[PDB]
Amino acid sequence: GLFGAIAGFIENGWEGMIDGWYGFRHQNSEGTGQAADLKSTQAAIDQINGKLNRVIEKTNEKFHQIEKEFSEVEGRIQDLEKYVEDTKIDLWSYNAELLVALENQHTIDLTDSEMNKLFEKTRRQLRENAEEMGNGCFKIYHKCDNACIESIRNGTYDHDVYRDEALNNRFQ
């Protein structure tokens, strides 16, 4: 939520998206369509999996310890044992809480950053043939086919072929 992409200038999500996490949706002169982008989804999935499998691997193995349940009242030694146990439990619960609280924030912020990165890349591709409409979509001022949007999707859009037509369409 630091970049303002998810829950920011993109109003809602797409519940019909089942291929990946991030994707496109175009409205053309031949109809409508929809697709996904594998790279951003893969980056997010790899980062989240790395984090998850980072935290959950084990570190402790204890065999013999002290007594923690007593049937009598004795004195100093029992008091010290109970104090030690209470201190250990209270000091580990705080770590358990803080780790989750920090990692959830970092996960949310990185999954928000990936969307902004994809948006900025798509903006940088359409050099001066498109205008940002403010709600997550680009208005492309020249006429594409279903093969023009796919060149924008797999990163080989050639902007200089449609430059003169777009400039005469948008500025006059």
């Binding site: 999500g13 175009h26 935290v55 013999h64 923690k68 358990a96 949310i108």
Partner: protein
């Protein structure tokens, strides 16, 4: 139309999951996973650990040789399980520093007992009792020797035992506290007893306390239990003139991974690496909220009952 449009967006799910963040306390994401294991199966799996079920016997009674714990001779355990239905059915006894001996024998992992030949001249061996019947007749503990006067005298016992091996030896002995001042002189002609057990670096001297006690199984006398550890190169000397419960040998002392646990859960033939007094619990999660007493590779005990970690983006539905 001579233009086009290209919109970007992300996915959402109808029901998401509420998680906590640094800023918000309830924020809805598309997916979350649980981090605190808070349930148990109810049984104690016997793999790959070696579990010993102390059905009706404690550790100390199985050490001394109670007649209803004679199946526990040379038991080798990796984790001793003590039940609450345990009881004693022999001579009433008492252990000063009971927890120390219980934790010393629990963490050793063996009840291997090597018998040794002591020479007690001038006394009568193999004393018995009617409170510790082993079969149809009177009996006693199987690892101890109750010496009394031989005819009309009780000489000063003075015995020695060297340690020429390369491991430590654990000796268990005791002292007999009689009930009246008449049964003292009828078993040990001296009007006062004393037991000294000494190594080259320590010594223990105990004196019997004549008096009356509550009736336990038909007796008002008592036995106090002590122990000694002999290291390689040392020597043991026992001096006495009455009220001696002599040993018959030594236990072998080891070091490793072994412990003891009080639990009333049954034992099955599953496979698990963690054991709690409630049963075995899986160890796929880093934290647990079942019991703070654990054996094996167990997760840590926390006070929270649920902690969810987000594994997806935020959920913004239509």
């Amino acid at each position: 139309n001579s233009t086009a449009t290209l919109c970007l967006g992300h996915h959402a799910v109808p029901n998401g999951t509420l998680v906590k963040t640094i800023t918000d306390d309830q924020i809805e994401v598309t997916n979350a996973t649980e981090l605190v294991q808070s349930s148990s199966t109810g049984k104690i799996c016997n793999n790959p650990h070696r579990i010993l079920d102390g059905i009706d016997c404690t550790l100390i009674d199985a050490l001394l040789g109670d007649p209803h714990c004679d199946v526990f001779q040379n038991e080798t355990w990796d984790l001793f399980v003590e039940r609450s239905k345990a009881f004693s059915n022999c001579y009433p006894y008492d252990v000063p520093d009971y927890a120390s001996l219980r934790s010393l024998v629990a963490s050793s992992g063996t009840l291997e007992f090597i018998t040794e030949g002591f020479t007690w001249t001038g006394v009568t061996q193999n004393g018995g009792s009617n409170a510790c019947k082993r079969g149809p007749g009177s009996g006693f503990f199987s690892r101890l020797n109750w010496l009394t006067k031989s005819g009309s005298t009780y000489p000063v016992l003075n015995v020695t035992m060297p340690n020429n091996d390369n491991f430590d030896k654990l000796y268990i002995w005791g002292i007999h506290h009689p009930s009246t001042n008449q049964e003292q002189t009828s078993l040990y002609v001296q009007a006062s007893g004393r037991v000294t057990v000494s190594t080259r670096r320590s010594q223990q001297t105990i004196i019997p306390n004549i008096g009356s006690r509550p009736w336990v199984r038909g007796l008002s006398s008592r036995i106090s239990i002590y122990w000694t550890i002999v290291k390689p190169g040392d020597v043991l000397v026992i001096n006495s003139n009455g009220n001696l419960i002599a040993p018959r040998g030594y236990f072998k002392m080891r070091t490793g991974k072994s412990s003891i646990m009080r639990s009333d859960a049954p034992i099955d033939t599953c496979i698990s690496e963690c054991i709690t007094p409630n049963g075995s619990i899986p160890n796929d999660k880093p934290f647990q909220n079942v019991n703070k007493i654990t054996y094996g590779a167990c997760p840590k005990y926390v006070k929270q009952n649920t902690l969810k970690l987000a594994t997806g983006m935020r959920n913004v539905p239509e």
